[PDB]
Amino acid sequence: GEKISGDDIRNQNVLATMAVANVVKSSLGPVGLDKMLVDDIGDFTVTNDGATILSLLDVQHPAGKILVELAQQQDREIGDGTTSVVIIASELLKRANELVKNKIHPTTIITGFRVALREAIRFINEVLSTSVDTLGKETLINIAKTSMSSKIIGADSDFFSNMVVDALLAVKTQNSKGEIKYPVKAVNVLKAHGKSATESLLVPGYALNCTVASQAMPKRIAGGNVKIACLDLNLQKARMAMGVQIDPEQLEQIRKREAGIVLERVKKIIDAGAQVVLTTKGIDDLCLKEFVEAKIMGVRRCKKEDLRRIARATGATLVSSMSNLEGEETFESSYLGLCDEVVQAKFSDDECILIKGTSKHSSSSIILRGANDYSLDEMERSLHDSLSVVKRTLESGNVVPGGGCVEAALNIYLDNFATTVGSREQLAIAEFAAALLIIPKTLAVNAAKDSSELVAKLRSYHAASQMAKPERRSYRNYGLDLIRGKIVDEIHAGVLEPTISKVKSLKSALEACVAILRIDTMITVDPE
Amino acid sequence: RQAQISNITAAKAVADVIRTCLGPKAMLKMLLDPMGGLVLTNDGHAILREIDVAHPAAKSMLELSRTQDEEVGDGTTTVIILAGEILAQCAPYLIEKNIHPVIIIQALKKALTDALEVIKQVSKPVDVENDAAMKKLIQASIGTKYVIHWSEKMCELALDAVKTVRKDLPNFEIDIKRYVRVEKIPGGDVLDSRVLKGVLLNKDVVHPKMSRHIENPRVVLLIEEEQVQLMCEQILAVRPTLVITEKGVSDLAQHYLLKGGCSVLRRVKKSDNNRIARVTGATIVNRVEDLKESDVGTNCGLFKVEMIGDEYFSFLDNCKEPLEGSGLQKACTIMLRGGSKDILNEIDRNLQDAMAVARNVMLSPSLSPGGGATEMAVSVKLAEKAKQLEGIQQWPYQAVADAMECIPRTLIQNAGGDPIRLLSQLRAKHAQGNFTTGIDGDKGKIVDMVSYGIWEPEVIKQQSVKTAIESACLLLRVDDIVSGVRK
Amino acid sequence: DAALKVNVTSAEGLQSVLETNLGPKGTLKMLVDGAGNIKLTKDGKVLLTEMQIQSPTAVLIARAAAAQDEITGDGTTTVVCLVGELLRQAHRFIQEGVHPRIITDGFEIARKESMKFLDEFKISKTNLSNDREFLLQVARSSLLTKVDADLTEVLTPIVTDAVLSVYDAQADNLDLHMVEIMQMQHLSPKDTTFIKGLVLDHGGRHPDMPTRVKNAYVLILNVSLEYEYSSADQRDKLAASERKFVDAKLKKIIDLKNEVCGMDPDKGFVIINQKGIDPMSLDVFAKHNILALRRAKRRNMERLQLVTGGEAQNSVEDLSPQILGFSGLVYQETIGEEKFTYVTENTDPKSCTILIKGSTHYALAQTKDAVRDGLRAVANVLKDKNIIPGAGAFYIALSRYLRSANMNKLGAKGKTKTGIEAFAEALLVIPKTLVKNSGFDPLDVLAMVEDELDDAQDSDETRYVGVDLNIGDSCDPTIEGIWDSYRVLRNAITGATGIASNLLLCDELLRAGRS
Amino acid sequence: AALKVNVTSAEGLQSVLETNLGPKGTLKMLVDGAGNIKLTKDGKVLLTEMQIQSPTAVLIARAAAAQDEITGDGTTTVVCLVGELLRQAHRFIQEGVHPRIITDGFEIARKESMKFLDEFKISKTNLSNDREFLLQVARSSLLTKVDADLTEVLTPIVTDAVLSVYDAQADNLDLHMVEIMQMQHLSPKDTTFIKGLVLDHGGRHPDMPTRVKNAYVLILFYSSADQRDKLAASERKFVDAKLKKIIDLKNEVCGMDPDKGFVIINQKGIDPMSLDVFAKHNILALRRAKRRNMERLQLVTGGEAQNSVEDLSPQILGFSGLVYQETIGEEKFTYVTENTDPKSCTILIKGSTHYALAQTKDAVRDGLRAVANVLKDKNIIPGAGAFYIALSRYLRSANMNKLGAKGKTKTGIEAFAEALLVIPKTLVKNSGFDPLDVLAMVEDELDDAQDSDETRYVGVDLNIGDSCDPTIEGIWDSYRVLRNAITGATGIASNLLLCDELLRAGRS
């Protein structure tokens, strides 16, 4: 096949990863903007999230797939703020080419980065923020204003700050052998066209979007102890045998006997007492009329994935077929659960059943209304990502100031750390410290400002903090303001990011650059 | 500027396509579809959905017109240009100021709040039940079509529809207009158009001997010789006068059902069976043996015969509902016999939009000057706040005032008047005398909209402009475009 | 507006298509496809069907003829002729700077003023007296616009006597009452003969079928008559049982026929089936003097009820004397492979059957298209008693009132006047086309008409002046007898105004789609 | 069969010059392969080097040849009439009219146009040499070519130039004043007129007289290497014999005191030693001086044009009142002013760039010729399309006055009346106004003038789009302008109308 050796492979790999990296760098920070991708198949999605973009983008050189899998790993760890994460490891490949031209061995480049990140853990612990730390009224609102950054939803921060915080307070459950944590991904987000974000509704529980099949069925159910039954059994004319096949009156009696049993199967649901029943596959008006006389609210054309979270939250047993230990078809009363309050509310020219007070599994749903689908495409993935930051905030109270405070601070620790190790690895620490400073410099590029003027002033304030151990405060200060271009403490601005998000960002970025540095050559076999 | 040119030029040519769709002087444009036919109309809602453009960024704006029609239901007459008009004055920005669009977002938000205050300043209440102003208000939105000849008769059908099939649950007029059926019959005149309480069908009778007429109808919605005969006896057990099935009708069922004195129809779509079930009160029958006495017809006065010179059609006469309220679901229809397919397709678009506009009239009883006077009235205060602002944001903020002046300018170019002296007189008259001064729909004069008789609701002005401004930020928030992704 | 003239120039060539097919002196144009169908006619619906078109604007021209086929069906050439004159005036007045809608708005005013003068120009006639002189003159002008003078003299009493059968005191005219036309190849096309009775299109397929009968009893069937082991003994029983289904019905026919009178089988009896016939039934039909058929139609059976009160039966279960009719005299003619039965001497037939004989297909296609287009045009004359003088007398007379208006109808100065002078001169292309098709000079004839109208108007006398294309001189539509129905001309002017607004209001041509 | 081919194809030729008509019209850029940029409304340049498509444009371009020697301005009426004539063929001739039937109506209308031509003209007195009338005619004449800036400058220049050419018989010849200086200097608005003669050369030596009053104008095998120098010594004596005779002959009047001006002009090169020997007597000589320009010196000082240096007489040397020399660029100019009785003037044009002079060079050549017809023929016709609109109404209603063949000529009469109405509509279309509303107001002014029992001539004001008076505004045309144009208007029309069929063939 085609095999090339030498620097030609590493040069084409860095230039390929840097070209696709500079495309997603325009979304860095609150001033970032979304971009459009042309799939040529008729589908398009406008978003700043690198997890989806790198998955959709066709990777030319096989070395580019390493950064694609890096974005997939961030989803399993954090999943939010991908604009500020995946672009960090992209700058390590640019300065690596100058080190390859030198006599430094590739493993020495790797070893220099290994001791840099291993020691950087203590560097983060010095600027580390405790659980209380700053004012932290609810401690969520201060973080909620940070999640509004990196996205275009920051103009709605007067609302979304209260939306995400007040909704996730009821998600607390006891699982993992007495561990208190929020079951992320169990929150259902709904979208509605028209008006603005101020019309969103907070549901302390599960909310399913659907209506009744027949308009004559009662649409209102009030009171407590509301039982729900999820029935996935398909009600339709039964097919024939294996192909052995078989008086048309006795032949028509097959449908008469089957539909007669189907009516009896619904009568067994009547004796259960559940107020809401669900049906997956569609039915005719014969079986629909029986649901009207059953005095039970039914729903058809149901998605299977929506009913799986119902049986989990409520606790009722999902019944795909009606059977018992005997040959009798019925529905036992032990398959139904209980809920504190269940009511169906009318929202945005539609109605949805609000299931609240789930005893088995507690969760919450957020029903949001917005302009249209294209305007909510960015607002969808952004809110799904913000659920992880709030989780990591109350799971571990460790947070760090954002806006380039960490990258500007780590440079000072590595300046004294470079002279500590010395020998040949001192140059690797200098290149690693300068590579971390590129991210805050590109932050002002998207804002059309001067980054070097701010970095020179910001680093001087972090230096006066480290140079004086005993410290009132005539020196210590931090924070960077993009709008006014000034240095102010982030306690007033309210920008703080969880520590676990930044630690795992640099932890995964270490092995990302090493995977490229370990490639001596690349060979491609022609397909059959 | 590499990816910004593709986004600007995507919606730049769209403005010239729909420029002829505004005002009573609106014209048409011939378009050749890929299917091999032709589409000639002045309505862009069907054009923007069926048009194929090379830049997918413009395809995102093609759905903005559909979103405005689903949420609001108006704007195809005028505001349809406003959706793509905002990007026209945004061109001398990136190539001149070289500033990120984020500044425009703060400029449009301040201009949106000031625009809502100007509309509220000229807002006036009007009685929705009084047919005085509502007669000219309905004709104002539909007066841009070929219906101008019959607009006197076309307004009678739209005025009586909003007071009959709407009702209410209490919240406004809220109801569903999709269940209301409008029958379109080509050929003849609209003088025979009446308000009918029952469903009409275009399918003929399967048997020659069956006579067509009914007094008190019974509607049923559905070896081999004796088996079907026994099936017909089960159908005739309730003695129905009408039999309707979605499938075909065999020749054997024609003779057996003839003994019962009923009419049999074939090739009836499920969309008609859903309306017949509600109007006639019968229940759609799947299994034939399920027919019972609960399927008898209800509130059907008389049955007649309407036949074209070619084939036979089903026609049900008018009736009423004995009272001796529940406006969520209503059963009724409006029969429309059109002269030609050109005007017939326009009336269906007008009648559905007139009921959609009159809906918003009764949702927000407040009323504002229409016909292009409001856009020039806002530009007086919108440009006045720009001089009072005196800041960096003034440039994108004052550029919005041009977008408000270009909306009536499109009507000027379509009418053929001189926009120079006309718009210069409007800006001077609005800032002094009153905001009621506007452009005449024909002569293009300084006559006020109060005496001229054209008005537009406040909700039509507020929601359409607010949606267009928020939708214009779509491409403004797109900093780059990537081609050849190959998902 | 660079693409505005694109659709105007491309659509201009559509006038020469039917230009030669307009008028009583017009000529014929041949259109032949690759399937072997030779269609020679002046009808535009057939010529615009299979002919490939370049400019898409011709599709809207065919849609304008849809309303003309129901109301008129004949003389639809004037629809495209008024558009061709408009297209020549299109780039003329629009180049002056006048907006296209301004000219369109001028047509709406001229159309309303035309309907005001439309009632004064027409002459109300009484259709109750059943005037033969009026019907022969109107039908004569319609036949000359389709076929030649040889078929005109023959079909003139045929069309006149056909419309007199359908009428009542309430002026009820059912177009579906008299429809079926007999298509046969016999002798020459000029030998077409009119029949006031009913004609059957099928006859006996067996030599033993009745040759001549008097009182015929028709038995109508629809459902298909043709019907389709341990030892070989079962194979003989299954094949023998195939004929038991047909023989069971044959035994009922024998007893039910002889029921009324079985002594003398000297009268007629006919069994009519849609599908093939069982050859086993022919043995019973021969000895019982029963006429049988093979592959017979259906819709033709419904005509027995409108004359003799017959009934078309589907299954074999219902047999009643109402199904069996009666006839005064029956003349059976054998032409080709299918014998033909004639039912004459009817008591009071309410529908007349058109018997058309000819040579070949294209010879019959000319007459078949002329009768259907000529009958529906005359049928609409009896519907509305208001009759409009024809021969283009209204188009020239209405222009005289439009050319001089001033303080009467003015409106805007130069905006409406442009549309007034346009529509006034747009109606003068029809008499110029009528003379051009005859081979004479249209201007020298029109100059004599204008001089005649000036002498009649100054003399203060009511007169209608037409154009005689035979001698190339002026005439009177009342003297010559050329007339037109009210709904024909009213919907023609209104229909021409609606189709004119489609091309004038088109701003630009756009090409969008997937290549 | 092929008659309709030349009618439809040549119809698109009107849009060529359509927008070049009127003082408010626009300009069209024409660049050839040699790099010559000509930007003008003139039709002679646009119809010459421009490539043509339809062969019918050959007769159209050749039709302007008669207009070049007569009018040269407003020649677009030739093309505008042909374009409207071909559109009338799609209307009147499409009805089946023979092409000659409408042709005979135009020939009859040509004689009727000449009868109405003498009634519409206004006679003026050119014997008094009134400048007030000349300032108005030259004003509007320059408005159709250049702007008002060059109009105000060139108005007194052209007016005072034609006054120097005159006699008791009112003899004005364009072949008298011909030479016009073309140079790039200062700005186009700085053009200065000189009542005397202008020379294109001047003193090349610092000792040459800068400013003087009186100026005397003098118009003009060897066996060894040593033997080869004898021929070079004899050839130098040839030019020395010409210079040595000048020193003695210039002593005629005063050779001792070099306090006056001295001039020597030669066609070919001269021995550079002349500058040394003439510096003592302060005699001026020139380098590469023209010839034809020397014939004008006989009309001022009474000198004589001389070829060789052998014959020199005191009659050749004249007496000049004042002589001034200006240094512009690398070529000095000698101005002759304060002349006793100058019989001619020299036009000196100053400009910036080449395209700036192209607009002025076309305006001066067309301006001097248009004023020439004003002094020759005293009859002056009001302009601004007043005759085209009036003549259209005179022939619109005729009936028993002028009819001819009944119905054959009347069809052509209405075509000629509607064809002349395209010119005023073209004037309004180029200005950006509505020609329908402007023409409607012009027709009302003519109806109000005829009903008032007073003879009046109403024009068209393109600025406000209203009616005006060509007499007050100053728009005027010579009688020979419309005399040859209307006579040629029938000839250009009969070319395509009498054209029968054009076949495609030839010798490859």
Author numbering:
A (entry chain a): 17 to 262, 266 to 490, 494 to 550
B (entry chain g): 18 to 186, 194 to 246, 275 to 376, 430 to 592
C (entry chain z): 16 to 243, 253 to 539
D (entry chain Z): 17 to 236, 252 to 539
From the paper:
TRiC is an ATP-dependent macromolecular machine that facilitates substrate binding and folding through ATP-driven conformational transitions. It consists of two identical stacked rings, each containing eight paralogous subunits (sharing ~25–40% sequence identity in the same organism) arranged in a specific order. An individual TRiC subunit comprises three domains: an equatorial domain (E domain) that contains the ATP-binding site and forms intra- and inter-ring contacts, an apical domain (A domain) that comprises the interaction sites with target proteins, and an intermediate domain (I domain) that connects the other two domains.
TRiC-ADP-S2, constituting 22.8% of the population, shows an observable conformational change in the A-domain helical protrusion of the CCT3 subunit. We first compared the S1 and S2 states and observed that, in the S2 state, the density of the apical helical protrusion in the CCT3 subunit was absent. These findings collectively suggest greater dynamics in this region. A conformation comparison between the S1 and S2 states reveals a most obvious upward movement in the NSL of CCT3 (up to 5.2 Å in Cα). Notably, in the closed S1 and the opening-initiating S2 states, the N-terminus of CCT4 bents and extends towards the outside of the ring, potentially forming contacts with the E-domains of CCT5’ and CCT2’ from the opposing ring.
